[PDB]
Amino acid sequence: MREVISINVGQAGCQIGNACWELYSLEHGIKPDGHLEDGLSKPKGGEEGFSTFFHETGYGKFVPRAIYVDLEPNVIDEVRNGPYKDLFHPEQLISGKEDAANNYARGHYTVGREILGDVLDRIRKLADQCDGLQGFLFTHSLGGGTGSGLGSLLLEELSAEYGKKSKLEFAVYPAPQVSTSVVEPYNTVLTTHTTLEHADCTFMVDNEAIYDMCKRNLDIPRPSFANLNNLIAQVVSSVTASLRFDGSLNVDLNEFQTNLVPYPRIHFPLVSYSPVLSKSKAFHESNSVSEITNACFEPGNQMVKCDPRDGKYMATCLLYRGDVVTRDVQRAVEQVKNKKTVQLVDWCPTGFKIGICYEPPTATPNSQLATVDRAVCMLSNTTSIAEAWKRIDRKFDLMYAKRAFVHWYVGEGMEEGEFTEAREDLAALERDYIEVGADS
Amino acid sequence: MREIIHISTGQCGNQIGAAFWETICGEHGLDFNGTYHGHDDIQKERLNVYFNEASSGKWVPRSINVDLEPGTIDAVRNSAIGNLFRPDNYIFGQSSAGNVWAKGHYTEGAELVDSVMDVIRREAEGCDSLQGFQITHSLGGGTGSGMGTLLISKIREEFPDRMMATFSVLPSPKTSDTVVEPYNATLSVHQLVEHSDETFCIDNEALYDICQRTLKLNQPSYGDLNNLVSSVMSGVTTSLRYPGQLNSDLRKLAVNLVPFPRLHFFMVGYAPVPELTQQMFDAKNMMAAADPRNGRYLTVAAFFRGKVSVKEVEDEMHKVQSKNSDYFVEWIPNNVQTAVCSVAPQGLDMAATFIANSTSIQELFKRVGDQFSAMFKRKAFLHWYTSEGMDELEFSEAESNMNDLVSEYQQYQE
Amino acid sequence: MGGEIITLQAGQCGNHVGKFLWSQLAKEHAIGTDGLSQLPDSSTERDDDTKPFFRENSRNKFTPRAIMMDSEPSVIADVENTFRGFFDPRNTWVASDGASAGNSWANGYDIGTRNQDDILNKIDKEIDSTDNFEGFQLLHSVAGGTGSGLGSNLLEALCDRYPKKILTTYSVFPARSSEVVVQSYNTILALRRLIEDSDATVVFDNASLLNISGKVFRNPNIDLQHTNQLISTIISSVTNSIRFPSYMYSSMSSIYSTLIPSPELHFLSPSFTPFTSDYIHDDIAHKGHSSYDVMLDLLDPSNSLVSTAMNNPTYFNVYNTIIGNVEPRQISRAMTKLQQRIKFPSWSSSAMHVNIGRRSPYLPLQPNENEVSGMMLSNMSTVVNVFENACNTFDKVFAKGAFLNNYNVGDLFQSMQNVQDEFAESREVVQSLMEDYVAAEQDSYLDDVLVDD
Amino acid sequence: NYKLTRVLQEAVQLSSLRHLMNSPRNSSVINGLDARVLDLGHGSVGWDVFTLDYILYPPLSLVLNVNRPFGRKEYLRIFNFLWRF
């Protein structure tokens, strides 16, 4: 369980992976040529990491194990001109000439299932080259039904192929206020049932909350999609900081499985990062750890468009980077329990996981970041997710009354029964979420 | 029967055993390269007891370090006295169980239990005078709490006559890392009560308190805590090894430290004669950690190293009995177990260790049982364990056994 | 019983006074305008104590425990620019409500109650960032209606949010009013909340301030910045007893115990000798004065900060703090000379109180002529005349109800009758305060218990 | 009174001598003061039963004078008077 297979699905997922590999190369100081980059360290790979995501070759060139799947030739041509394609293998990437649909119709249909067998043997061949496997990492946005449909198809095939490793899925959630795509709520609701049966753990990140962070914390006038990809790269890099760099308290991926999946059907952890501020403000201001731990509970850092105060506390995780010792984060949670910011329960309350990592956080040159020797990445399970679930469900039910487009979906690959089943399933998850949250 | 085997596992038991060997070498005199430096014969005896005489006068400690991480063995090798180790003495598996005792002793531990049992059998064949097995692990982490529990059960099934002394790091109620931590801890102890013979209560919050009070340590790291526990373990093992007025064996502790064979937990304390007795009978110096005014003393024992007076220790025992006869039970009626070592401790003129059996271990059991119940009432973290194979009936049986032990400790009221 | 004090800057005048006070404290403790302490961190031996006023985030940086709240963002931005990194950008409150829509206490209270959540959250954060707390120091600046309303809202929140904390307030009164009616309305509405909730209140009349600024300074033109510098130096002198702890007074509560004999009488009068830390302080070594002359100048009406109007003034609690190389024999001589010159009431035998502080070891040493300075705080009923000014203004204008179209908007009362009743109740409560003051000025204020047991 | 000694050890931060405590020179110099309480009275108030006992050590005992058991208790009576006040 030393390798984690990462898959980039959809346009947003492909861009997220590129920034993820770029920051992964920036932390280890990896250039397009490398040979490690170069071979002098110890601990920039080898030893692990990179030995979890980058494939080790006979020559020593680290090949990042990534499968860029997409049906749009423009995004595939964009990822191939850069040095990332030279880092990956030309056979690992999959090319598509015609986009599936707009957006979930053909993304989950049998047309998207024709390449399912092709990528399946590619993963089998990739797993045969390396040794061991810790889990499957997925990066696809729930806004795009094509990436959501293909991501769910790959998730279902991997579940029936091995079924021995936990399947991780990083999902990007659109803005609950404004939605550019008219079928965007439909693609998300239909995918929530798929990720329910297949994924063992999920990740909910909102785009509007990230844009609010860069406009308030980073103090930039014009947000960009590259800035969102860099912040997601810092998030993904933080959850696997112990798997890439050794620390005083090394945490495992299964340690996240035994903390973020706390109920018969609960696989939805909320991620938050602190401290995040401007590079100029980081040089002028210097806060304490107690101030940072309190900042993880703020609505801005939660990366969701809902207030966490109304939510009910559940088992959480907190990973720390750089030089972090026990008391300064303990005396923080000593006061956090005394402050009672989030309403505690009688089941979870003793669930503030503390993880230490020696690797300090790195700031990308494109997106600002609070330059601090120690970072905090809190993976919470607060009950504000149902508030976001009910928020998108009301817009889903309000639209589903007429929905103005049912003839296209029932004709290509879907039917009205599947939409009703996904609605009843989503309502069942929300009802079970409130029952497991209000039982305290 | 003077030789003792050492087993280390878990995320912190590895460093615990490393510091144990470090303090043992610092006590008797030895280089990390195996060169003998003690004087003259008792040190060679201790080396024959704990280490192994290799070629060219080399000395390698008899330790079985097992964990689900290569970084752990890398760290214990990069440690000062960690360089030379036989590749058969340590065997590490891949990759992790994820803070789950069930998975840890079912899948992650069963694949290496055969190899570790073959290793321990070869070690027992090579060690003729083995008497006890010192286990060092953390009951908090599920992986270690499963691996150490499986190893203790296997050694109990193999050699039921050899003593089993465990220094398991108990989880703390304030340390709120994972809700599954105390649940795995109680599931581990539900089997350890039958698989082990002696266990020493070591709480993370207790260690934090005892370092913040004495060292004034602004941030308690596991390093200095393991160093202090290592000093305590070196003292309690030199109480048997080093010459003194009266040596206490593991069998002696088993036959004098507990009235009924069901009880196996003992609360420990270290010092730093009247000031030492005050520290021992105070709450801020215990590592269990219990309250002397709350718990009812069932039995006690005090061992000393250095130039100590038997008349002074008898006067102190009489005074503390006359002043705390309310906690001291009347069916003993006067509990006393004193061992004296004439040798001087390393860097100290006199040292003291204290062992007790009060009515607060049952209170900690009540706390962890209430945690388990008010955590699993909403079926929290149960799909993982149903996929693993554990049963709610087994959990209820474990809780009922814990309640039976609580009644045995209240028999015997507080 | 010594705790930390958090500064509350309110309004333009309050923000300027707070900026001047923090610059003076930085100059005294060698901190500068950059936030980073000018003294090296290796020299940890400090006779003073910046902890009650400066939060130590880093080893060399000392962030002042202060919060600025204003409706005009221009002054806040100017302060933040002139103090690069010194102030905390998170403790600046503007609410993005734009400029103040008038100078009305109603508008001030409205803009306070609308964003009461933000300022209360910031206060809770500042309290959580510290451990030991004693109370706040609010700068009303009652000359401005918006600032007075904001201060009244802050007081009405703090009284029932932290009742176990002692509250001190500083109300700056103008010399001549441009809009006499509106400014009197605002001042009386602020004094209402002062009587209701405030524990201690120090008045600062601008007439004596302008007089001192014209006397001791060389430039005839008077500027608001070096005008507020006087109140800055006064606040620095009254907080010195906590910054550099003396051997008699080391707590704000201990200082106010001998100054507040009753919750009704909570108005003081300050006085100071010719300053030495102001801009034009070179004309101080030509007086050749001792501590006795310093006490004489402190008791003289020309050195007070408020309009004295001494017509046989009745003193209740007179206290003085002397900073520098002070002589006990000279203190005894000054006390003997003042006990035969200060009018004392026949019912209370309490005399004046003297305290000796310590001079800063890093401040520029002054020559032997003005190396010793002094501050005096007297519980005098002379402030009832400054209050009666606005009281008779209210009595002569309220018969018609002028400027009623400005106090009706913003506040919770939109009708004219409700505002009229509120103003009448405020006039009644200030009249009762003045009656209690003129009754305490007499001997019956202690014979009341003798006649009725 | 062992919890009393504990809270005394904790109150060193709230004490006004933090600037001296930060320096290693006053370290163990502040600690030379002994936290010993002599019981004065049967069931009396805590203020009355509280007592300050100081023990000196060379080479400072040969110079400074403290409340020695065979002395006149000068510091003891002065501290008692100031304690009543």
Ligand SMILES: Nc1nc2c(ncn2[C@@H]2O[C@H](COP(=O)(O)OP(=O)(O)OP(=O)(O)O)[C@@H](O)[C@H]2O)c(=O)[nH]1
């Ligand atoms: N002496 C003195 N008075 C000041 C100073 N700053 C403001 N004032 C008072 O403020 C009044 C003018 O109104 P503003 O300063 O605009 O106060 P405001 O109308 O409430 O506006 P804001 O304070 O920004 O809320 C004058 O009558 C002064 O008495 C100052 O620096 N020195």
